[PDB]
Design a protein around this nucleic acid. Structure first.
Lengths: 54, 310, 317, 54
DNA sequence: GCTCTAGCAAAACGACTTGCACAACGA
DNA sequence: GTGCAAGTCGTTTTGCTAGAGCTACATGTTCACTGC
DNA sequence: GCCAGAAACCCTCTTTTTTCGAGGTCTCGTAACTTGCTGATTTATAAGGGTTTTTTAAATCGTCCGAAAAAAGGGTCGGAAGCTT
């Protein structure tokens, strides 16, 4: 459950892509990037504004 | 530690090999008193580095100066990993490297392509194998004392009959099958002697019961020992006598055959019945191989067939 | 496991290591080599799966467990002299490299049977030697005259002179009645190649030194490159199961001659240009080795070597 | 003095190159690899043998 | 002798807490 | 309110030290069918 | 017969859930106290000057720690020198 390995393929010239991930996919995003900082503080205060547009 | 008196082959373990003051020296827990100091260094010697050992490039230089073959093998010396290639003695090569070229490859190839002679070699292999069965199962009572008490008259009759069959049949295809039938009967006899109950020989390691696993380990060690024999003789592994001409590593299996049923099989059943550890089994096998002079026998056989084939 | 490790086809592994002043050991299940760094000892990784062979130089030592792993992966280990010198040499004896071939990884049984089938008749050997040289000539032409990389790097060569030299030598090869004449042609071919390479590279006059004793950069690089070629040849001949001893051309002054016979395929088609090229740049032995291995990878030297051995065995039927 | 950055270039299909290193070059070998482990313990033991070949 | 395993301690590392400045200097 | 910086402090990673074991698990053949 | 999906089995991490342990805390039971009897024998004591042992501070020594200083290294800018044009 702790395994998190990402494999990137350089297609040559200007392009590269993500082939596969082994283990916890949540440690990477779709393009294979990794978050740089993590917090449990309540950033992104969704509670403040609501969708009742009318 | 002299692993084969016929080949001047030595096994080194728990020591570093290095060169200090221009002489190759062994750094060992016994210091000056280790037996390794009695190792003769000459073009006749061949080393087998064992478990827990390391060697310096400088040593490789001095050994090359003296022309000493080197090879790395696992515990007890059975699994041979890597070694120096040994030269071939013919009139068109002629380097002055002081390395004792060995002429057995030319003898081997001189007949390997002639099928009739190849068959004659196969017969010779099996004659040796059977006679080593009769010897270890009956003539020597060490196994008897250890607990491998088995009937003699049935075994002697079966071996006599198979020997009578060896002198007949036209092609490899029969010899293989005759051996297989003898194998089955030997398995049955061993199981009866051991009171192991019914036994069926699974292959490709699909078995689960102790007998099967111990047989696999024993065979693995036997193959390693045969590989050492061939390497000492310089014959490549592909020039099989009794296995198929397309079998990768056939020759070693041909050579390994002359001990499996003589020395490995009884020990596999004995240890399984005794409930030994795998490590205990391994140690017992190596002890049996040492007691029987197995490597020397398999060397003598290959030399004998070469000389006989002329 | 012994399987699931020899999956990279040997003709496509992308490394070949040269090591000095280090100890090759096993650590945490991995095969590593350690170097003294003053502050600390530094462990360095060795990817046995993507490795053709190791060359170990001066002040270097190896441990048994590492041999077990390398043998499993089918990697050759070779003990050699320091950075371009024989491991051993005295009077008129030389031992360039001492090879430790794996013995627990059984190898195919056909190429060996063909080779040993024809190896015991001098005429058939001579035909094999002819095939080796014709392949060498072919590689020389293709590489020198049809490679954009070498040209762009600054290896501008006289096409006409090279062509006539190739044609002249090839005809002489056909005329070759026996080995001695063949070797003389080899010698004449070789230096004419040196001459062409040098003055095409603005190096000026040059001469090939003897038994790795050269002083100028060109000779030192050539001597060093030879070992890289030896390494690739040794693995090429092993992966087909052919014993090193069964040489065809250089056998009667060398132990394990067949390695050298094979190496000639690549000695001159590559290496030789790169050596002079680096000398021009004032490069450093570390750089020359790096660039040389890059060229060997790009040109698929090992694949060409393996194909040629298959063919010549094949062709002897 | 703690800074150590290595920059690799993929000049094409199945080949890569090392461009430059910023900072402490001792953190890499010539090809730009990085050691797996290091220890102040004397593992090499070069003291044991000497070069007096005669 | 060589390597692996278990237990320890030091150091590195990243997130949290608090107090506070409130920036970015060719034409 | 947003972000910086100085100080804290819980993990987490590395290396050090004793101590103990010492592996590496089928291998009857020939040939027809299947991938790049 | 081919293909697909689902299900049974193996291993380890992460998180609650339970359990356990230390320990802390309170309250009442009770074996050994206290109070009361007599008379022969043993022990303590009122003052103060001269005299042993321990406490206490100061000094010294050693160790440890931290801070400062010095060294080392990464890098930039400008100037001078060498080479080429």
């Amino acid at each position: 459950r702790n395994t998190a390995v990402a494999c990137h393929w350089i297609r040559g010239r200007d392009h590269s892509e993500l082939l596969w991930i082994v283990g916890d996919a949540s440690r990477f995003n779709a393009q294979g990037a990794v978050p740089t900082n993590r917090t449990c503080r309540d950033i992104l205060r969704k509670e403040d504004e609501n969708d009742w547009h009318s | 530690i002299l692993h084969s008196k016929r080949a001047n082959l030595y096994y080194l373990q728990h020591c570093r090999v290095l060169v200090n003051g221009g002489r190759v020296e062994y750094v060992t827990d016994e210091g000056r008193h280790s037996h390794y100091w009695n190792i003769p260094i000459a073009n006749t010697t061949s080393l087998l580095l064992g478990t827990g050992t390391s060697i310096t490039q400088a040593a490789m230089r001095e050994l090359a100066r003296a022309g000493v073959l080197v090879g790395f093998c696992g515990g007890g010396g059975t699994p041979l990993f890597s070694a120096n290639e040994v030269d071939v003695e013919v009139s068109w090569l002629t380097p002055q490297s002081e390395y004792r070229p060995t002429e057995y490859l030319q003898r081997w190839v001189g007949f390997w392509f002639d099928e009739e002679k190849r068959l004659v070699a196969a017969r010779h292999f099996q004659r040796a194998r059977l006679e080593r069965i009769r010897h270890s199962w009956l003539e020597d009572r060490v196994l008897r004392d250890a607990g491998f008490a088995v009937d003699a008259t049935a075994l002697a009759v079966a071996v006599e009959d198979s020997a009578r069959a060896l002198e007949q049949a036209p092609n490899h295809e029969h010899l293989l099958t005759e051996e297989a039938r003898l194998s089955k009967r030997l398995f049955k006899l061993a199981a009866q002697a051991t009171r192991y109950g019914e036994f069926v020989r699974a292959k490709r390691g699909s078995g689960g019961d102790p007998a099967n696993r111990f047989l696999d380990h024993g065979n693995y060690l036997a193959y390693g020992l045969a590989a050492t024999a061939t390497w000492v003789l310089g014959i490549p592994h592909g020039l099989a006598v009794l296995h198929g001409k397309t079998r990768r590593g056939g020759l070693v299996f041909d050579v390994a055959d002359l001990i499996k049923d003589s020395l490995i099989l009884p020990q596999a059943f004995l240890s399984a019945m005794r409930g030994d550890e795998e490590q205990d089994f391994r140690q017992a096998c190596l002890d049996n191989l040492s007691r029987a002079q197995a490597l020397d026998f398999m060397i003598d056989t290959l030399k004998d067939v070469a000389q006989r084939s002329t």
